């Protein structure tokens, strides 16, 4: 019952910013990673970004570089995805995939996801 | 003589080749699968094979118990308006998804059937009342036998029916039922109708279902709380777990790709999409 | 009328004077008259998949041209 | 009565136990079975049967008849891939839906060798030479024939014998691979590149299709039975 | 005490179990049985005995002595039935109350061959030829001799030997038929038609009766014991 | 003093190296002194129904005329 | 405890109409049929009409054709039998036989029935 | 060290291929060291009641005069 | 590997065709590997108390004068 | 197919006519087909620690100078 | 069913029981093990391996690399100790952290002989003669060579053979000693004193180090398994 629940909406104009959050529970054995994934309207699910357990050491996807910011608050047991400069390519669904990981690919817990739409 | 727990054929050391023999070339028009092994196409060393197919044997593949149905019954207060809930379930593996799909890997089967009964009870109304440990009768009503209409009518005498009185708190209930099929194999799929629509008859008189044999194939189970009315309401859930033992099967069929819809083979719209998006030149 | 069958030893205990070594067996005795009641033996046969792999009338010889 | 002591586990119900129990219909006359053609004894038997692979799973080609067709052409020779495929039979969208994968989806671990078979479906007059290659993991997945040619492969010539088979020899660190996407138990890469090119004379369809099949080999096995995800019951 | 583990099912009471248990009156001197004539060993034994069938179950003839009598006459020859009957021994009102049916009402499945016997009960001087026919199911139940004659039948001549027997040979899709009305396990049709006609001289009763009997054959059997509906206890 | 009896195998498991094949038996040992206490054997005889079917003094020969 | 309980009465003049209903409960595994049967004062029980599971595809008995209407409301889990042009032949008991079926004959659940009388 | 004893069959089941016929026996094995603990055998002797019926010094001959 | 030992019969039941008479025995089979776990045998030896009664160097002869 | 093994007697009971003396054994019979299910035998081997103590190529002779 | 009687202990779970139980994955194909070098069969085997002793556990030397070094010098001869050590392998801070002690920390009782080995680590040109001595308990722990020399000891000469070994012969009142500090099961005293002195020529480091090792002997054993204190999980 590691409950991963996304939030943040998705209905901004082209160029703005949104704050994608994710409430985590159950037993997230800290050590490993915590991340974000997008499926897109009509493409394959793609990796967005991954942040380390509690460590603020992270990476970003080539496509999203610098325009997306993924952090965390292990006190609040949450992870955040600030997204500046939203665009017509960023229009998609976003998922908080934060469990196990060890890298940027392995998982045992996903969320229900939320849709984002950058209109214009 | 080649058993389930046998070591698999070894890998023979084969060297370089330049001959008129062609393991590599075939023709899948013949319907036949080209039967090769690594050595046929690449140089290999000798390998004493250790792995066995042990677990993949038909018997082992079904060696698990599986939840077929959840029967709900209750024991309300004597003064109550509604009747004491006693369930009747038509015995079939197709109410749940898991076990069904596994059984659908083939066209026909024979298996002695093991049923397990996991009962679980609780109160419902906010009150501190008491209920003494409850008993539960599970009566198998074969096709045609009198189905109980009341929770306390004559039918529960079970002079010929096979019943199981389960006392709550003890280990789950279990009974063995052999291959009880009217055919020489159980039929997972039946491409046909029970009736034939004759011309000297009205369409209604000759109509029936598609894929059905006998409406009543195996019978119904009837479960009731044996203990009488108690001032505090107690609901119960009996979970049935089936493990097909001594199983044989025939003619494999492609596994179900889209979610089930009804007892048939039919598929609902909005579920006709099983494979996801993947680009041809993307690993 | 006990049924003694052998087991396929997996993890070998540091023994060959009780366990690990000298073939480990197990006993089974049926308790009911009905065949249905018995425990699942698991000592089943395997077979040639050719009845599915090569459903052809004329034998398949891998080394030669399929269609001759 | 014989003195006894109840041990840990008593009264518990294992869904995978194998005990004897009482019979509901004592002395039931069971009808004898008959010789029904095609009897199966093991799941692997089905795994060794070739099954068509839905390679091209594009949003416009997925879930249709077009997914199994990999279209080749008479365009000049290049070194760019026709089709790429990762060896993870039970987790790669493409393989995961073939017989093999499905059976594989009921187990936690798989091992053995696999064999891919490619069927050309062009006009008699169409010729060519393709290269199908399996590169073991641990490096850069090839994107040019140059690299792919350095691994395990078969150079196929299109002719009278229409089908070609390339075996993927079981080469892995562990004795058994996970039936899920995992780095530690990765499988490598299957690739197909034009060896020469496709050549067709006049008045001939310049593009045609190739169909792919996959099947386990006599040495293949599966272990640790598990529940599949390729099906569910919502409420 | 010997270490033990309690398994699923313990403490449960199966009404069809077959276990040993303690005795209330240890060392009870049981009185020996005696050779009481007519001992039965199996239910089927009773099933093979002929029993009179209440054919004509009209609202005015049902539940009386008149139900067993099928009245024939000296009316000119026609092709219309004297009596129709569906082969569903345990579900057809007519058969369901004969010994066979009753025993059958305690089982879920029946199989084997059946035999009907017809007894003429007219005056010695009355002659005739009747046709009793069993048509397997899957078609139009005959309404004219023309059709019935196309199936399984016996052409009976009334004479010194007063009783005639037509066997219904076990012809069914399944190895066992349901003991309830079911299409999938249907049984067919039993019919009786005038072959010629009934002829009587002067001063002779122009109408008489025929009595029907039914019985299972050595090859008949019943399985899957069940509770009957032919009896109940209201409150 | 165990009683070993054979079972009439119905659904044959894919075995002949434990189950299915080589005749399946079952053990039974009475636990009480009273005959009443025993479990019902079920290994009972059948018989000729003629004592009911043909209660006639002179033998019934199906092939000939009943009343001669 | 698949409780089938008929209603609708039966005491109309010759030519009128009645609404025969049937409350259903327990577990009616939709797929199959749901129907009506009459026993008559002194005749054999006869099939009236059958309607499909949830489908409004039905049939009628030769005798009742068009003069009887059988529908359903699976939201209310009920079946209805409107009967116009009642006659001296229609005077009888009616039963809601709605279970299993698959056709127009097989059953495992009946009701207690109700009597109809078309007087004149 | 099992004790196998025979039972006095009362109600004979329709069998002589398991029950009814071929002498029915029962097994017993003591579980304690104390004689007191054992189950009551019931295989006891009977005797002549004359020690109570005819407590006379000179033998009683029914056919002759009692007092001679 | 059963251990069959005899019992010292106390109250004799009216039998010598099952109980009372023909030596009553009991079976015992250990269930654990540890000696500690076993049931107490009770088949123990007795001994001469002289090691306490006559702790003297020169043998005690009851019939003669103690101090000679 | 019982497994009878001997026990290493520790505290000797005052017996040699049941316990203490004549070698004490224990019975074991497996109840499952899987090797995993068995009880831990405990009848394991020991070995030479030299594979850790003397990981040297040329044999170690305690009586002579180590480095020669 | 066979009459039985439940005895004391039934249903209880001993963490040290050894019973049979049902298997979760029936027919699991276990992968065979391979000859992995260095296999261990018993804990004692590890105990016989020499392990470096952190002798000097001063607040400034504890928990560092300096703890294992016992520094000697070329100062004139005295009768004062270089190092003292009490034989309580599992309770004395110094020994308690060596392999021996650790294994010992999992048992309640230990027995057998022990052997200490001392490695000189000075320059080739440095010579000397030391005296390592084990005095059994029950008296005044020596503080001068004079006393120590009265017990069990080895007079070691520093030379080409750099390592010296003194065995502590198992001399104890009880057959097994407690693995904790206890008077009743006391072990005695291990001491090292300068026999002569350390002599070094010119241009030579006047002070150097000696390293100590400890290991059990073939005759050593441990009993009554227990939980260790050398580790814990706070919350
Ligand atoms: C106490 C219960 C006794 C009898 C229980 C009878 C239920 C049998 C269910 C068997 C399911 C086999 C399904 C195969 C379908 C087929 O035959 O076509």
Interchain pair F44, H8: CB under 8 A:
no
Q: How far apart are the first and last CA of chain D?
A: 50
CA of H35 to the centre of ligand 1 (A): 53
Nearest chain C residue to D25, by CA: C34
Ordered alpha helix ranges (H), D142-184: 145-148
* Whole-angstrom distance, CA of residue E68 vs CA of residue K128: 131
Q: Is there a contact between B242 and B114 (Cβ–Cβ < 8 Å)?
A: yes
CA of E223 to the centre of ligand 1 (A): 14
Chains K and D touch (3+ CB pairs under 8 A): yes
Helix (H) or strand (E) run with residue F50 in it: helix F50-53
Query: Which of F13, F23, F38, F39 is best to mutate for the C interface (most C CBs within 10 A)?
Result: F13
Closest CA to B194 of B183, B182, B203, B206: B206
For B57, E42, E118, F44, F49, the CA distances from E37, given in Å and listed in that order, are: 56, 16, 30, 19, 13
Breaks in chain A, after residue numbers (C to N greater than 2.5 Å): none
Distance from the Cα of H46 to chain I's closest Cα (Å) equals 9
The minimum-distance atom of ligand 1 relative to the CA of B183 is 17
Distance from the Cα of J60 to chain K's closest Cα (Å) equals 14
* Whole-angstrom distance, CA of residue G42 vs CA of residue G89: 11
Q: Is there a contact between D138 and D171 (Cβ–Cβ < 8 Å)?
A: no
Domain total of chain D: 1
Would you state the structure tokens that stand for residue B163, as one six-digit string? 């019943």
Q: Are strands B173-177 and B106-123 parallel, antiparallel or unpaired?
A: antiparallel
* Whole-angstrom distance, CA of residue K220 vs CA of residue K89: 12
Tell how many helices (H) and how many strands (E) occur in chain J: 1, 2
Q: HEC string of B62-84?
A: CCCCEEEEEEEEEECCCCCCCCC
Q: Is there a contact between E126 and E199 (Cβ–Cβ < 8 Å)?
A: yes
* Whole-angstrom distance, CA of residue C36 vs CA of residue B181: 14
G23 bridge partner residues:
G5, G78
A94: Cα separation from own chain's centroid: 6
Max CA separation in chain C (angstroms): 61
* Whole-angstrom distance, CA of residue G107 vs CA of residue E91: 13
Q: What residue's CA is closest to ligand 1, atom 18?
A: B187
Interchain pair K24, D16: CB under 8 A:
yes
K10: Cα separation from own chain's centroid: 42
Q: What are phi and psi of E230, to 5 degrees?
A: -70, 20
Interface of B with C in 68-107 (CB under 8 A): none
Neighbours of chain I (3+ CB pairs under 8 A): E, H, J
Q: Can you give the residue range of the structural domain that contains B234?
A: 1-283
* Whole-angstrom distance, CA of residue E168 vs CA of residue E154: 10
Domain total of chain B: 1
Q: Is there a contact between B195 and B206 (Cβ–Cβ < 8 Å)?
A: yes
Chains D and F touch (3+ CB pairs under 8 A): yes
Distance from the Cα of F8 to chain H's closest Cα (Å) equals 15
Task: State the DSSP string of E9-67.
Answer: TTT-EETT-------SSTT--PPPP---S-----HHHHHTS-EE------TTTTTSSGG
Query: Which of K24, K27, K30 is best to mutate for the B interface (most B CBs within 10 A)?
Result: K27
Q: Is F23 on the interface with C (CB under 8 A)?
A: no
Distance from the Cα of H67 to chain F's closest Cα (Å) equals 48
Nearest chain J residue to C19, by CA: J41
Closest CA to C35 of F19, D62, H53: F19
Task: State the DSSP string of D30-95.
Answer: PPPP---S-EE-BHHHHHTS-EE----B-TTTTTSSGGGEEEEE-PPP-SS-SEEEES-TTTSTTT
Q: What residue's CA is closest to ligand 1, atom 9?
A: B218
Instruction: Give the mutation target among B186, B189, B238, B240 for probing the ligand 1 site: most ligand atoms within 8 A of CB.
Output: B186
The minimum-distance atom of ligand 1 relative to the CA of B113 is 10
Nearest chain I residue to H3, by CA: I18
Q: What residue's CA is closest to ligand 1, atom 14?
A: B186
Q: Mapping DSSP to helix (H, G, I), strand (E, B) and coil, where does residue B270 land?
A: coil
Neighbours of chain F (3+ CB pairs under 8 A): B, C, D, E, H, K
Nearest chain F residue to D29, by CA: F10
Nearest chain I residue to E4, by CA: I31
* Whole-angstrom distance, CA of residue E93 vs CA of residue E102: 11
Q: Is B114 on the interface with F (CB under 8 A)?
A: no
Distance from the Cα of G110 to chain E's closest Cα (Å) equals 14
Q: Is C19 on the interface with J (CB under 8 A)?
A: yes
Task: Provide, as residue numbers in chain I, all residues whose Cβ is less than 8 Å from the Cβ of H35.
Answer: 7-11, 24
Residue pairs between chains I and J whose CB atoms are closer than 8 Å: 54
B241 bridge partner residues:
B67, B116
* Whole-angstrom distance, CA of residue G11 vs CA of residue G19: 12
Sole residue written with tokens 């997945």: D141
Nearest chain F residue to H43, by CA: F33
Q: Is there a contact between F27 and C33 (Cβ–Cβ < 8 Å)?
A: no
Closest CA to D27 of E168, B18, E18: E18
CA of B180 to the centre of ligand 1 (A): 6
Task: Provide, as residue numbers in chain K, all residues whose Cβ is less than 8 Å from the Cβ of F31.
Answer: 2-3
Q: Are strands F3-6 and F25-28 parallel, antiparallel or unpaired?
A: antiparallel
CA of B218 to the centre of ligand 1 (A): 5
CATH number at residue K196: 2.60.120.20
Interface of D with K in 165-204 (CB under 8 A): 175-176
Residues with beta carbon inside 6 Å of ligand 1? B 91, 93, 113, 140, 162, 175, 177, 180-181, 186-187, 217-219; D 24
Interchain pair D24, E5: CB under 8 A:
no
- To one decimal, the resolution in angstroms is 4.7
Task: Provide, as residue numbers in chain F, all residues whose Cβ is less than 8 Å from the Cβ of D23.
Answer: none
DSSP category for residue E160: S
Max CA separation in chain K (angstroms): 95
* Whole-angstrom distance, CA of residue G34 vs CA of residue A26: 48
* Whole-angstrom distance, CA of residue K52 vs CA of residue K118: 9
* Whole-angstrom distance, CA of residue A99 vs CA of residue A95: 12
Q: Are strands K4-6 and D2-6 parallel, antiparallel or unpaired?
A: parallel
Q: What residue's CA is closest to ligand 1, atom 2?
A: B140
E204: Cα separation from own chain's centroid: 33
Q: Is there a contact between F32 and H8 (Cβ–Cβ < 8 Å)?
A: no
Would you state the structure tokens that stand for residue D67, as one six-digit string? 């997914």
Q: What are phi and psi of B98, to 5 degrees?
A: -45, -65
Helix (H) or strand (E) run with residue B103 in it: helix B98-103
Domains for chain J: give ranges and CATH numbers: 1-68 (4.10.80.10)
**Determined by which method?**
cryo-EM
Closest CA to E132 of E89, E95, E165, E99: E165
Pick from G26, G47, G103: CB nearest B88: G26
Sole residue written with tokens 């109509």: B207
Task: Provide, as residue numbers in chain J, all residues whose Cβ is less than 8 Å from the Cβ of C40.
Answer: none
Nearest chain E residue to K6, by CA: E1
Query: Which of G102, G106, G107 is best to mutate for the B interface (most B CBs within 10 A)?
Result: G102
Q: Is there a contact between K115 and K167 (Cβ–Cβ < 8 Å)?
A: yes
Question: For residue B151, with 0-12 CB atoms within 10 Å meaning exposed, 13-18 middle and 19 or more buried, which class applies?
Answer: buried
Would you state the structure tokens that stand for residue E119, as one six-digit string? 């007894």
Q: Can you give the residue range of the structural domain that contains K160?
A: 1-235
Neighbours of chain G (3+ CB pairs under 8 A): B, E
K156, HSE (Cβ side, Cα atoms, 13 Å): 27
For H41, H52, H55, the CA distances from H48, given in Å and listed in that order, are: 21, 9, 12
Q: Is there a contact between D210 and D31 (Cβ–Cβ < 8 Å)?
A: no
- The three-point CA angle B148-B152-B154 to 5° equals 60
Would you state the structure tokens that stand for residue A54, as one six-digit string? 């509690």
Closest CA to D225 of D15, D32, D61: D15
Task: Provide, as residue numbers in chain E, all residues whose Cβ is less than 8 Å from the Cβ of B155.
Answer: 227
Q: What residue's CA is closest to ligand 1, atom 7?
A: B218
Distance from the Cα of A39 to chain D's closest Cα (Å) equals 12
């Amino acid at each position: 019952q590691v409950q991963l629940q996304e939030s943040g909406g998705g209905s901004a104009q082209t160029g703005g910013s949104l704050r994608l959050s994710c409430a985590a529970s159950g037993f997230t054995f800290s050590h490993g990673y915590m991340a974000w994934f997008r499926q897109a309207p009509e493409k394959e699910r793609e990796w967005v970004a991954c942040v380390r357990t509690s460590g603020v050491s992270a990476y970003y996807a080539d496509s999203v570089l610098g325009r997306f910011t993924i952090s965390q608050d292990n006190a609040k047991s949450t992870l955040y995805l600030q997204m500046n400069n939203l665009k017509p390519e960023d229009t998609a669904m976003y998922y908080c995939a934060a469990t196990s990981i060890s890298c940027s690919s392995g998982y045992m817990f996903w969320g229900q996801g939320t849709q984002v739409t950058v209109s214009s | 003589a080649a058993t389930s727990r046998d070591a698999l054929p070894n890998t023979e050391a084969s060297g370089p080749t330049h001959s008129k023999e062609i393991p590599a070339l075939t023709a899948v028009e013949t319907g036949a699968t080209n039967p090769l092994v690594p050595s046929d196409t690449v140089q290999t060393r000798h390998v004493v094979q250790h792995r066995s197919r042990s677990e993949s044997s038909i018997e082992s593949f079904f060696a698990r118990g599986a939840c077929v149905t959840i029967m709900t019954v209750d024991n309300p207060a004597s003064t109550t308006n509604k009747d004491k809930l006693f369930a009747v379930w038509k015995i079939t593996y197709k109410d749940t998804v898991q076990l069904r799909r596994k059984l659908e890997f083939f066209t026909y089967s024979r298996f002695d059937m093991e049923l397990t009964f996991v009962v679980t009870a609780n109160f419902t109304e906010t009150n501190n009342g008491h209920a003494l440990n409850q008993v539960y009768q599970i009566m198998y009503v074969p096709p045609g036998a009198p189905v109980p209409e009341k929770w306390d009518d004559y039918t529960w005498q079970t002079s010929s029916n096979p019943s199981i009185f389960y006392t709550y708190g003890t280990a789950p209930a279990r009974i063995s039922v052999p291959y009880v099929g009217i055919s020489n194999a159980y039929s997972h799929f039946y491409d046909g109708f029970s009736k034939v629509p004759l011309k000297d008859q009205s369409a209604a008189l000759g109509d029936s279902l598609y894929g059905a044999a006998s409406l009543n194939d195996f019978g119904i189970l009837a479960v009731r709380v044996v203990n009488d009315h108690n001032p505090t309401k107690v609901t119960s859930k009996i979970r049935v777990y089936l493990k097909p033992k001594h199983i044989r099967v025939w003619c494999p069929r492609p596994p179900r790709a889209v979610a089930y819809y009804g007892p048939g083979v039919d598929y609902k719209d909005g579920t006709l999409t099983p494979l996801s998006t993947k680009d041809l030149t993307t690993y | 009328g006990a049924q003694v069958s052998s087991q396929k030893v997996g993890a070998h205990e540091n023994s060959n004077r009780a366990y690990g070594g000298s073939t480990i067996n197990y006993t089974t005795i049926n308790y009911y008259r009905d065949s249905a009641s018995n425990a699942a033996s698991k000592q089943d046969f395997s077979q040639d998949p050719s009845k599915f792999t090569e459903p052809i009338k004329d034998v398949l010889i891998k080394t030669a041209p399929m269609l001759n | 009565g014989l003195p006894v002591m109840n041990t840990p586990g008593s009264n518990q119900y294992l869904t995978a136990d194998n005990f004897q129990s009482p019979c509901a219909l004592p002395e039931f006359d069971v009808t004898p079975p008959i010789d029904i053609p095609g009897e199966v004894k093991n799941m692997m038997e089905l795994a060794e049967i070739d099954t068509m692979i839905p390679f091209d799973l594009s949003a416009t080609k997925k879930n249709t008849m077009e997914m199994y067709r990999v279209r080749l052409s008479d365009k000049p020779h290049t070194d760019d891939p026709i089709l790429c495929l990762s060896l993870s039979p039970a987790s790669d969208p493409r393989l995961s839906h073939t017989m093999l994968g499905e059976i594989l989806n009921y187990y936690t671990h798989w091992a053995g060798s696999l064999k891919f078979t490619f069927l050309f479906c062009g006009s008699m007059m169409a010729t060519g030479k393709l290269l199908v290659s399996y590169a073991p993991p641990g490096a850069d997945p090839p994107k040019k024939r140059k690299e792919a040619m350095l691994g395990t492969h078969v150079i196929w010539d299109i002719g009278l014998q229409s089908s070609c088979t390339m075996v993927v020899p079981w080469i892995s660190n562990t004795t058994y691979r996970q039936t899920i996407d995992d780095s530690f138990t990765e499988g490598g890469y299957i690739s197909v590149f034009y060896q020469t090119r496709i050549v067709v004379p006049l008045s001939t369809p310049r593009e045609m299709d190739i169909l792919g099949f996959v099947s386990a080999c006599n040495d293949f096995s599966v272990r640790l039975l598990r529940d599949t995800t390729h099906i569910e019951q919502k409420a």
